[PDB]
Amino acid sequence: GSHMPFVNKQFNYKDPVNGVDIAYIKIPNAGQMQPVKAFKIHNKIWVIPERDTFTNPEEGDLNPPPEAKQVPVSYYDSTYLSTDNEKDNYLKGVTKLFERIYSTDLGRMLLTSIVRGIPFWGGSTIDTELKVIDTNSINVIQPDGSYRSEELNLVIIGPSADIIQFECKSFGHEVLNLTRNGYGSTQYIRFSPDFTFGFEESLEVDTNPLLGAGKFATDPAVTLAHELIHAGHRLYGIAINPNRVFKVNTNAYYEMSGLEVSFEELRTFGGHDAKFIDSLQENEFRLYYYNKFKDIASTLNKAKSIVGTTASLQYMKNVFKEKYLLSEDTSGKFSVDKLKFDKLYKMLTEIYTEDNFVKFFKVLNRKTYLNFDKAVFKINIVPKVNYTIYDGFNLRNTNLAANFNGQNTEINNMNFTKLKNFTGLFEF
Binding residue ranges for Zn(2+): 226, 230, 265
Active-site residue among 167, 227, 264, 427?
227
> In whole angstroms, what is the distance from residue 191 CA to residue 204 CA?
29
CB 401 within 8 A of CB 394: yes
Residue type, 64: P
Least CB distance from residue 7 to another protein, whole Å?
25
Interaction partner, residue 402 (another protein, Zn ion, none; CB < 5-8 Å by kind): none
> In whole angstroms, what is the distance from residue 15 CA to residue 381 CA?
21
CB 179 within 8 A of CB 234: yes
CB 316 within 8 A of CB 203: no
Least CB distance from residue 425 to another protein, whole Å?
12
Interaction partner, residue 73 (another protein, Zn ion, none; CB < 5-8 Å by kind): another protein
Is 227 a catalytic site residue?
yes
Binders of another protein among residues 144 to 173 (CB under 8 A) are: 164-168
Tell me the window of 188-196, 233-241, 263-271, 335-343 that interacts with Zn ion (CB under 5 A): 263-271
Phi and psi, residue 77, nearest 5°: -155, 95
Count, residues near another protein per rule CB under 8 A: 19
Binders of another protein among residues 253 to 272 (CB under 8 A) are: 254, 259, 261, 265
Least CB distance from residue 216 to another protein, whole Å?
16
Tell me the window of 142-150, 223-231, 292-300, 397-405 that interacts with another protein (CB under 8 A): 223-231
Return the number of the residue (265 or 391) whose C-beta is nearest Zn ion.
265
Least CB distance from residue 265 to another protein, whole Å?
6
Binders of another protein among residues 364 to 393 (CB under 8 A) are: 369-373
Show the CA angle centred on residue 33, arms to residues 31 and 34, nearest 5°: 130
> In whole angstroms, what is the distance from residue 98 CA to residue 1 CA?
12
294-328: b (≥16 Cβ within 10 Å) or e: bebbebbeebeebeeeeeebeebbeebeebbbbbe
Least CB distance from residue 226 to another protein, whole Å?
8
Report the binding-site residues. 226, 230, 265
Q: Does 197 bind another protein (CB under 8 A)?
A: yes
**Which residues are the active-site residues?**
227
Binding residues vs Zn ion (CB under 5 A): 265
Where do contacts with another protein occur on this chain (CB under 8 A)?
73, 164-168, 197, 223, 227, 230, 254, 259, 261, 265, 369-373
